[PDB]
Amino acid sequence: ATVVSGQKQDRQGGERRRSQLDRDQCAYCKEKGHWAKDCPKKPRGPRGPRPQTSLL
RNA sequence: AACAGU
Ligand SMILES: [Zn+2]
**CATH number for the domain including A55?**
4.10.60.10
CA A52 to C1' B1, whole Å: 31
A23-32's contacts with Cβ under 8 Å and 24+ in sequence apart are none
Structural domain for A28, as ranges: 1-56
In chain B, which nucleotides are within 7 Å of a protein Cβ? 2-5
Q: How far apart are CA A56 and CA A52, in angstroms?
A: 12
Q: How far is CA A24 from CA A18, A19, A30, A42, in A?
A: 13, 13, 10, 17
Question: How crowded is residue A30: how many other Cβ atoms within 10 Å of its Cβ?
Answer: 13
Q: How far apart are CA A16 and CA A54, in angstroms?
A: 49
Experimentally determined by: NMR
Count Cα neighbours of A54 within 13 Å in the Cβ-side half-sphere. 2
Is A28 within 7 A of strand B by CB distance?
Answer: yes
Q: Which nucleotide is nearest to A32 (CA to C1')?
A: B5
Residues 6+ apart with CB under 8 A from A28: A36, A39, A41, A42
Is A50 within 7 A of strand B by CB distance?
Answer: no
Overall number of domains in chain A: 1
